């Protein structure tokens, strides 16, 4: 069986705390399609309620106390979060938790310290003089107390923040005997600071807590791996020790994919060399591939469509997508694949052998805050096609710029598997693929539905499949 992951929220959920208990609900049906695993979204205290998780607070506040307004998160109490893993697991379905390190915000107080402000688009340069702000550094979490961890949080955890209170100003301000972490992403100098209260993750005591955190973690909800949030603008170097100290302590192997969100292939493959390929990365390259071809008119030449991704050039450890909570419309990614060509990308990620797959809450049930309707009867028969036909020995034909396809033999012990896939971002029409000499006389049906006719396979193997106009059609043998 292929692995499935599925990203289980989108941006503009309701603040009704209902998500864990959809999961517990909605488990059974997923792993029966085949989903393997489910990325869910940060389940710690975030600034309020309603923070999607990135605002992250309170690390081992799971829902359970009463701190920031409230004391479920948007998604749920600490309990309801449990029984979901616990669920998932029923089902025979991996939990991925999201781990937010880069910033911490919603201080309890405030501190004075000596700070400069920075360029945003230029951290490395200083554009004032030293001057004394007030910072909100202090992190005392009055409503958990010392339970789990007594770690109080104060400006020496932190490399400098977004907010001065006492003159009510927004600008980046580093903190004076502080400096920027290093390796991290170039874009903007040095891309270290991003939001709230920067964690500076060249202190020990910041080090050795999030390391705490954990293990403590992995162990109080029975997670089986993470995803790990803004990873371009956190030390390099931090991840590999943190995973080799949690994956040890634990005894889980903990897959991990990072999010290093760049269209610059060149940027994953260094930060993939500087963590030693200890986890996978979001393509996020292909990503744009899907973008710029939905967008393209039929122009974009689909020969092209993998090339330069996460995909082709290190597909084991590429986690592949075609949407996502920051790429949705109003969002700060904002590059939202048309609905035309989004069964076409889904077929591409779901059916080829390359990377690990990641379907998108907002396609599979919709996003009804822009009214985008629900595209689960487009991807069901897609993820049918991997759960059942997706197997064996794959060959490619990405050779014109619109119709382009792939074949999979089908495996050895999976029998009835083998698919022939085309996509086209033009007009439709035929590819001659060979499929195998051992499916020699059978007949194919597309499964998608789009197609009504046949393909019977010659005495060679090959087959003449067809597809139509902007559209996808996955042919697989009949029973
Ligand atoms: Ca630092
Ligand atoms: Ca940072
Ligand atoms: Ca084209
Ligand atoms: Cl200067
Ligand atoms: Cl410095
Ligand atoms: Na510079
Ligand atoms: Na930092
Ligand atoms: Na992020």
Not at 180 to 199: I, K, Q, S
Request: glycine share 10%.
């Amino acid at each position: 069986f292929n692995g499935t992951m599925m990203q289980y929220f989108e941006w503009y959920l309701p603040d009704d705390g209902t998500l864990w208990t959809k999961v517990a609900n909605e488990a059974n049906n997923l792993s029966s399609l085949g989903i393997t695993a489910l990325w869910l979204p940060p389940a710690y205290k975030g600034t309020s309620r309603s923070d999607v998780g990135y605002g992250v607070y309170d690390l081992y506040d799971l829902g359970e106390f009463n701190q920031k307004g409230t004391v479920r998160t948007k998604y749920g109490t600490k309990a309801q979060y449990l029984q979901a893993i616990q669920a998932a697991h029923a089902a025979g379905m991996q939990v991925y938790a999201d781990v937010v390190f880069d910033h911490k915000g919603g201080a309890d107080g405030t501190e004075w310290v000596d700070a400069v402000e920075v360029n945003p688009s230029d951290r490395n340069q200083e554009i004032s003089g030293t001057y004394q702000i007030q910072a909100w550094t202090k992190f005392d979490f009055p409503g958990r107390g010392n339970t789990y961890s007594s770690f109080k949080w104060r400006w020496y955890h932190f490399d400098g923040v977004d907010w001065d209170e006492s003159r009510k100003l927004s600008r980046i301000y580093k903190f004076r005997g502080k400096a920027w972490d290093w390796e991290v992403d170039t874009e903007f100098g040095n891309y270290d600071y991003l939001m709230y209260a920067d964690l500076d993750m060249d202190h020990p005591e910041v080090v050795t807590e999030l390391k705490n955190w954990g293990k403590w973690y992995v162990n109080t909800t029975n997670i089986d791996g993470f995803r790990l949030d803004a990873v371009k603008h956190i030390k390099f170097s931090f991840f590999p020790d943190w995973l080799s100290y949690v994956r040890s302590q634990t005894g889980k192997p903990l897959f991990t994919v990072g999010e290093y969100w760049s269209y610059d292939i060149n940027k994953l493959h260094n930060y993939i060399t500087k963590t030693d390929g200890t986890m996978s990365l979001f393509d996020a390259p292909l990503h744009n591939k899907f973008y710029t071809a939905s967008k393209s008119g039929g122009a974009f030449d689909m020969r092209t469509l993998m090339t330069n991704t996460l995909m082709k050039d290190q597909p084991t450890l590429a986690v592949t997508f075609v949407d996502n909570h920051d790429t949705e419309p109003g969002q700060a990614l904002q590059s939202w694949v048309d609905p035309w060509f989004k069964p076409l990308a889904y077929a591409f990620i779901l059916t080829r052998q390359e990377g690990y797959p990641c379907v998108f809450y907002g396609d599979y049930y919709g996003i009804p805050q822009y009214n985008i309707p629900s595209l689960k009867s487009k991807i069901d028969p897609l993820l049918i096609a991997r759960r059942d036909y997706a197997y064996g020995t794959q060959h490619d034909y990405l050779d014109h710029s619109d119709i382009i396809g792939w074949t999979r033999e089908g495996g050895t012990e999976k029998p009835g598997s083998g698919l022939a896939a085309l996509i086209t971002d033009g007009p439709g029409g035929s590819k001659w693929m060979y499929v195998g000499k051992q499916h020699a006389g059978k007949v194919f049906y597309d499964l998608t539905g789009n197609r009504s006719d046949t393909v019977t396979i010659n005495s060679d193997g090959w087959g003449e499949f067809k597809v139509n106009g902007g559209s996808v059609s996955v042919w697989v043998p009949r029973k």
